[PDB]
Design a protein around this nucleic acid. Structure first.
Lengths: 91, 141, 129, 149
RNA sequence: UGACUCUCUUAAGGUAGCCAAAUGCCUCGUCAUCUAAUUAGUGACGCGCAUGAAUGGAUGAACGAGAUUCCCACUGUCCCUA
RNA sequence: CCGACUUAGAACUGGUGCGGACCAGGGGAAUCCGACUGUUUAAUUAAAACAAAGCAUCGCGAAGGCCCGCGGCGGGUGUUG
RNA sequence: GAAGACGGUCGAACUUGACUAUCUAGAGGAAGUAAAAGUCGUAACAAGGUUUCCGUAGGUGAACCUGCGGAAGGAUCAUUA
RNA sequence: UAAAGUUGCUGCAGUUAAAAAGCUCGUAGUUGGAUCUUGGGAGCGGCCGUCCCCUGCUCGGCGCCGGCCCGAAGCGUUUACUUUGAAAAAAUUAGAGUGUUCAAAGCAGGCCGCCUGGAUACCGCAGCUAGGAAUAAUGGAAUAGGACCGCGGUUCUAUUUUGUUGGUUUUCGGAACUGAGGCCAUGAUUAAGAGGGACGGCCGGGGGCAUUCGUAUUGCGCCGCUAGAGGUGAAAUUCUUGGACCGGCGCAAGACGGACCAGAGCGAAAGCAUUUGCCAAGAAUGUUUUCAUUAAUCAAGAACGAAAGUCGGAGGUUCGAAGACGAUCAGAUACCGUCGUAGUUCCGACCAUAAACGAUGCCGACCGGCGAUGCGGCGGCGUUAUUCCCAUGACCCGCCGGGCAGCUUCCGGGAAACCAAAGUCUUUGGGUUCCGGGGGGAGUAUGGUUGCAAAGCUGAAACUUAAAGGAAUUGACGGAAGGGCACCACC
RNA sequence: ACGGGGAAUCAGGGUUCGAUUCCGGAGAGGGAGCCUGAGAAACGGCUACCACAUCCAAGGAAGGCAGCAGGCGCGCAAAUU
């Protein structure tokens, strides 16, 4: 069954810390504990080891990603932007 | 009506029933909030004890003192302004009298000059206020 | 969408009568329209028509006179008993002299006069006067 | 008027009155069938077959030359698609739109046009189940539809 | 009672809130409530000696060997001692 | 044929006695303060004090900010940015 | 074969709690409506002297003012290569 | 209760008087295209109206020579519908007979013992019954498990039979099951000026992502020459010999996408306008493609939803709620002016409202004209470009389909303003949704619910009140626009 | 709100009423339990408890008009022991 109405992962914090700080923490807590599709093997096995370091359980391939997510919104724009400066330098 | 289909009786009936509440004469009668507020409690007439004599100012166009009576009912203990009709009939009405009180005509709406005076005095101590006026009876004291 | 083919035909011939057209086209033909039209014709409120026969819902070209005041449908098809037919023709026909309620009985599509003689009611189709 | 648009467009094919075989065509009913079985083998929908037929072969309608129409011919041999050919393309169009929203969550109109397509799949499904041409336990499933292209 | 007006006057004249609060001298404030009786308690009222906005204001579920008041239950705290 | 711990229900029964010792939350309606857990005057104050997360200011791009040292091409922050 | 008694049974009834409908008190607060002639202004109606109005914000003795976006119920059916 | 067609099934309204959800999706609900039996016979009163017929297979007679008809019963896609028969307390209602002296009533009475009443109709639905077979549902054979045939066989096995005695399978009769071949014209209506889907060339400020440009504005670096600049109804605050404003070069940032730009296009609405690329979508047209009713409208439910607002991150050029000042003023916490916070911008979540307006729900039918326009297609002299033709663009003359519109008129409507839709409405019924019921109180209180909040959705009553309101008319008025006249105006 | 037969108004639809003499149901102050009998959960039968009230020589006893009359109360509202 559905156990909690509107808390999720952050039901573990009980009444502590404030509703907004529990809400803000929830969006992170889901993403950092989520399993992601390994770009190298396709297996949903990219689990966060520590901060910024993600590890495929099957490939045994480590990726330097974001704190709470695999990709940071910024580093995805930078990889696009660096690649377009690369296409202009190379001509 | 709008929906005409041969198998549309429950919508036409339930629509007519739902939209009947938006009528004033219906919702007043069929929710008992009017009857709970009606000082007579659905009765045509009611008896009550005269406890003072109020000189009600008429509406702006007609400037004159309408000599009414504050009546308290035997059945409710609810207080009421009742318009004493005629020229000098108030003289036959003294404090602590079982006067028979009726509505004025508009089924619980204030009539003509008198503001918020929905009732009138019919009898005084089981003797008609018309008979006292005509001089066919006298006030038993 | 088109949910009474008889209704979208009776109105089509009625708009042409109001205007004074000498013949009218009514795009979908049904056996129900043809049977309605033939009943109007035996009383003589229209001239002879011809059903144009495509390999579809046919068309009809009705030769209009100027005798037809109004040709009107009744939707839905209210089932009529003989004891209730007098009340219909009270408040649907102009006078008790002229005008006809047609209604689909078991004995075939026919006017209330022919439906009285056979002592057999049915579902009301429409009317004309 | 359309299902999922305000368009009231009058634009469809208009068959000729006469349903006879035209008196120039050298194609017999048996040779039109052997030609559909040649085309259906190629991975070609009943719609695409009938186009190729009236274009480069002069057979106007298969229903007029033969007795049966094209899907009713495919099916009697056993070359017909399992789920119908129109339902296939709606499921195909939904899977296309959903792959577009895998990168474009900002696209509110692709999300809106998805619901209209998704609605039409669940609307033909409740038709194709009453005709017993889909199995009763057929469900449209966004997760697994991509492999049923 | 004073929306309004007149004058004096500042760098700006205390806004939103809150209150005889752990902040109110007068004071056991005034009204209500709780009592048989309440300088106590809570709820209100604010010309507030001397409230008030990160010298943070107002709130506030959960929490507390925190500070109060009342009720039920309990009882040698007491009647009144053995 | 080997069973090993329970659970529910019933009958009867005792001087209404049975979690029989032991173990083992009094409760409710409210106000004030501090969100909470944490900490604190060892030897009179465990608190409303401190801390805390959150919040917000400030400094500094290293020849720098902050800081140490009697001293130095000294030292901490700094295996830092 | 009487009283009477164990147990079962139906079960009034009072006791306590809970829920529910109805009626009603209340310091204080904040609204509505009705008055023949209260105070302050003049918001609206004429381009009503700042066009009006709508939604949403914030502000102001008060009507109201102002930001943003809409509307014509406008004070323009029109503005000329 | 009628009046009240002011509850509207009959039968009301919803552009402006009260009223169409901001928008689309969507399940119940409601509603759904056309299509399958007609043609003749045979008698009837004067070319004409009328009765009658277009099932099948054991009992008994008008019987007749193992064959023939008529009649009693069991039977046969079904329901809705209609008609019929039944059963359906009286009293009451309707109504027959009837001088209560009349009448309300009563069921009595009437003839010179006799005679006669105390009927009948109606009794919503639902149920039973016998026709009718139009209408509206509904059914069959499509991996033929197919109707109709006799054949081959498999078994439990009536009783018609082997003198009375016993047994067997037997013939024989039904019940269920298989192996065959034969047979019917062997079986599938149509392809909606319904819909979906394919396809073709297109089209569009449709949507998203990245990219690119443009000037302006602001700030800055420097270089000039200088005393003012700026702002206004008039000023002032404000900038300014510490060089302002101005002029010139650069540089930086963040906005915005002028003119072209239209009563033009696109989108469900909100909305959408620099270049180019990428992504999926879409209407319309074209169609001798495909499926074959899949549809329309929709309680509940769901997507989107301007601006403002809220939350977190980046940014902050301009403008600019609040705030500060300068004015104006009696006041001016306003309009005007100078500054300036949140906001305005972007990313990701919330909010779900607008005069979200065409104040006009959607689908379908029909009912005048005209010239345009946008899009696709079709055809038709000729000009022009790629010139070197062919096919294509650009014009030109139409036609057709959808589209935003416009003018026109006694289609008609409407209280009118106005409306080819607001028409086809007392001559009232195409389908369906939402919603109004005098004005206030009030979109209030209350409860529920959604949201971080703001608030959104749902939503009373007491009380009050004779009007509020719509359209149009005439005057009067205007700090509206025009046109006059006058030495009681001016020049 | 006992239901129905019906009633009032009524063009055609309807709308409203039906405690009320006929039919059916229910109940006898509130519930509950029973006895007798073919038939009762009977009340002009019984037994309990509750409410109400009666006579008493204070130990006890006795009650049930929503039967017909009548009284009191309630009321705008209704008859002769």
């Amino acid at each position: 069954a559905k156990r909690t109405k509107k808390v999720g992962i952050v039901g573990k914090y009980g009444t502590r810390y404030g509703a907004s700080l529990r809400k803000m923490v929830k969006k992170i807590e889901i993403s950092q504990h989520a399993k992601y599709t390994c770009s190298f093997c396709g297996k949903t096995k990219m689990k966060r080891r520590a901060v910024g370091i993600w590890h495929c359980g099957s490939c045994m391939k480590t990726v330097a990603g974001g704190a709470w997510t695999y990709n940071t919104t910024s580093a995805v724009t930078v990889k696009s932007a660096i690649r377009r400066l690369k296409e202009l330098k190379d001509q | 009506g709008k929906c005409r289909g041969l198998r549309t009786a429950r919508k036409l009936r339930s629509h007519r029933r739902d939209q009947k509440w938006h009528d004033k004469q219906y919702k007043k009668a069929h929710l008992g909030t009017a009857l709970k507020a009606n000082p007579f409690g659905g009765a045509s007439h009611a008896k009550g004890i005269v406890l003072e004599k109020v000189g009600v100012e008429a509406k702006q166009p007609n400037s004159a003192i309408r000599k009414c009576v504050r009546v308290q009912l035997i059945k409710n203990g609810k207080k009421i302004t009742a318009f004493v009709p005629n020229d000098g009939c108030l003289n036959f009405i003294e404090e602590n009298d079982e006067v028979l009180v009726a509505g004025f005509g508009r089924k619980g709406h204030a009539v003509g000059d008198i503001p918020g005076v929905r009732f009138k005095v019919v009898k005084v101590a089981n003797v008609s206020l018309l008979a006292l006026y005509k001089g066919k009876k006298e006030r038993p004291r | 969408v088109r949910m009474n083919v008889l209704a979208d035909a009776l109105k089509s011939i009625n708009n042409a009568e109001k205007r004074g057209k000498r013949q009218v086209l009514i795009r979908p033909c049904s056996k129900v329209i043809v049977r309605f039209l033939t009943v109007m014709m035996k009383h003589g409120y229209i001239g002879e028509f011809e059903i144009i026969d495509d390999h579809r819902a046919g068309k009809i070209v009705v030769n209009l006179t100027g005798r037809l005041n109004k040709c009107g449908v009744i939707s839905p098809r209210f089932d009529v008993q003989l004891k209730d037919l007098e009340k219909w023709q009270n408040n649907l026909l102009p006078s008790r002299q002229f005008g006809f309620i047609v209604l689909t009985t078991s004995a075939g599509i026919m006017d209330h006069e022919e439906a009285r003689r056979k002592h057999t009611g049915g579902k009301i189709l429409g009317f004309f006067f | 008027g359309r299902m999922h648009a305000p368009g009231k467009g009058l634009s469809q094919s208009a068959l000729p009155y006469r349903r006879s075989v035209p008196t120039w065509l050298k194609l017999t009913s048996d040779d039109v069938k052997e030609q559909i079985y040649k085309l259906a083998k190629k991975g070609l929908t009943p719609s695409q077959i009938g186009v190729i037929l009236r274009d480069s072969h002069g057979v106007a309608q298969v229903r007029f030359v033969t007795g049966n129409k094209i899907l009713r011919i495919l099916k009697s041999k056993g070359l017909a698609p399992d789920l119908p050919e129109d339902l296939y393309h709606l499921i195909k169009k939904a899977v296309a739109v959903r792959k577009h929203l895998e990168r474009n969550r900002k696209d509110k109109d692709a999300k809106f046009r998805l619901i209209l397509i998704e609605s039409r799949i669940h609307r033909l499904a409740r038709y194709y189940k009453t005709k017993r041409v889909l199995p009763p336990n057929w469900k449209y499933e966004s997760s697994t539809a991509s492999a049923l292209v």
